[PDB]
Enzyme design. Structure first.
Site, PDB file in Angstrom:
ATOM      1  CD  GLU A  57      -1.474   2.097   2.266  1.00 31.71           C
ATOM      2  OE1 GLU A  57      -0.299   2.357   2.621  1.00 31.71           O
ATOM      3  OE2 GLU A  57      -2.466   3.113   2.701  1.00 31.71           O
TER       4      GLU A  57
HETATM    5 CA   LIG Z   1       1.294   2.936   4.282  1.00 33.92          CA
END
Ligand SMILES: [Ca+2]
Ligand SMILES: [Ca+2]
Lengths: 289, 288
Positions: free
Chosen positions: A241
């Site tokens: 992410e």
């Molecule tokens: Ca992160």
DNA sequence: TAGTCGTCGACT
DNA sequence: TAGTCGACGACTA
């Protein structure tokens, strides 16, 4: 300056190799702060997103912690480093009535025990969704910080946080970054849908299931990297992410290599002169190569 | 069609014939025990059907919620034969919304359904305080909140201050006050603090003009004591009801006596399946 | 006289 | 890698 734009595979490799992915996590692990102080440090950090300031604030306790946090929220009294009370860029909007109502919410809920907020968010861990929903109870705490906290609950606090299938819940920027990647990265294989058709390589039509296909391919790509700060497991969606998000910034001209380690140390050196914890924070920070 | 009356004449009709809010009189007459009254009210506030609420008000504890979930699911037949009826104002208390509403009540009151109305009523308080308590419950919004607050005072007799509530009236009465400032020549001009006159245009009426309208109608009906028992002069609570019903009257959807006629027709069937439902039918006021 | 939900734009 | 507010339209037999 207008630097070379790298692929995600090479930019992520750099982020992992130089611990420029998330250096705060390493520094925090190195400090080995006591529990109650660590929780105060964290709640301050999640409000102001500035490591040196959180270190200074982590030394005040009880209602004196919230009083000093309300002063940083009001940003009218000068700061122990001189000037106004700084914010991290991701917390640039934590000001005015939004910051003060935020602190009144925490004071109303935790009274003389600020250490309880991170302890409640951390629980004994749980699923990403459970952890982020607990974070998002607090005023001025939304989807970005919920994900960040869940990452830190696992990487910093060592509680077990399951992130399985979180890719479809990523914050707008890492998610948009996954959409761009499906379009532009030829190493990501075609996403063969259940009907046998291929998902169109167009960032404007990337669905949650293709973002998941993207994240899953990147996780496998970086599987030879143990995740920082301690290298206890292979990379998962939590590191991907971050690689996804920083890569989009990198491509946009807004993340030259080492940006975070350099920015962290520069904004933290002033505080190293007003707080012993801040001095330990700056000295635990990793350095450029 | 029918004759469309002015608000002064239509409101006088609602007040004299107890067609303003006939359920309050019927409830006051029935003199039900405390816990049943709270169950009757909760049922009515979910389904807005007096006869149906009367029937359900006789079941207690978790058996009350089981029967309320049956009305919410509307899959078993109803003791009256047919489906479990809804009042027009609760036409949307159906499907997942009704069952979600009932699940919420079970989760919070468990085996004490009497506690919902008691919590809403508390010991009274401000209209604002009560409607916020009412509106904690799933599928309870501003309309029913104002209604419950009215009923806590008119039916339960607890002290609810409705002062300056005009600016908080629900969509329709509020639009009725906007229309009223445009069309009713009896309402004096609203002179603002800067001395300017607010324009006679329903689409440009502000909250302070809505309050000004509500205040003029309160004064107009001050010679009327409020139902059910005439304990005080009419206030914003009756005027809010006159405003909405007048807007309906003007739209063709409320000829004189509409409520008293409709309630008895929908309540007669229930009189045969519940002793309480029969007392409700017999306490209901009559035409003329 | 219905209430709930998500999107969008404006604001801080 | 931000979050909150209110306005608005679509939806729920
Ligand atoms: Ca992160
Ligand atoms: Ca009313």
């Amino acid at each position: 300056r207008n630097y070379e734009k790298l692929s995600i595979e090479e930019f992520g490799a750099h982020l992992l190799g130089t611990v420029d992915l998330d250096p705060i996590y390493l520094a925090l692990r190195r400090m080995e702060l006591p529990e109650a102080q660590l929780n105060r440090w964290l709640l301050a950090y999640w409000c102001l997103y500035n490591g040196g300031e959180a270190s200074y604030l982590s030394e005040f306790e009880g209602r004196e912690f919230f009083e000093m946090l309300n002063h940083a929220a009001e940003n009218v009294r000068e700061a122990p480093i001189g000037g106004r009370w700084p914010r991290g860029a991701e917390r640039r909007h934590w000001r005015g009535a939004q910051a003060t109502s935020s602190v009144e919410y925490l004071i109303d809920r935790y009274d003389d025990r600020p250490e309880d907020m991170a302890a409640y968010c951390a629980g004994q861990g749980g699923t990403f969704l459970e952890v982020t929903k607990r974070v998002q109870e607090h005023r001025l705490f939304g989807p970005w910080i919920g994900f960040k906290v869940a990452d830190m609950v696992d990487r910093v606090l060592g509680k077990p946080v399951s992130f399985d299938n979180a890719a479809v819940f990523m914050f707008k920027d890492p998610y948009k970054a996954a959409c761009i990647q499906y379009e532009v990265n030829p190493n990501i294989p075609d996403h063969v849908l259940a009907d046998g058709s291929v998902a169109p390589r167009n960032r404007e039509l990337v669905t949650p299931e293709t973002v998941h296909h993207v994240a899953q391919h990147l996780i496998e790509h970086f599987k030879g990297f143990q995740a920082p700060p301690l290298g206890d497991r292979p990379v998962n969606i939590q590191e991907v992410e971050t690689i996804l998000c920083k890569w989009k910034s990198h491509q946009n001209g807004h993340y030259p290599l080492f940006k975070d380690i350099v920015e962290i140390r520069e904004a933290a050196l002033p505080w190293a002169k007003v707080s012993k914890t801040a001095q330990a924070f700056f000295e635990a920070m990793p350095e450029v190569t």
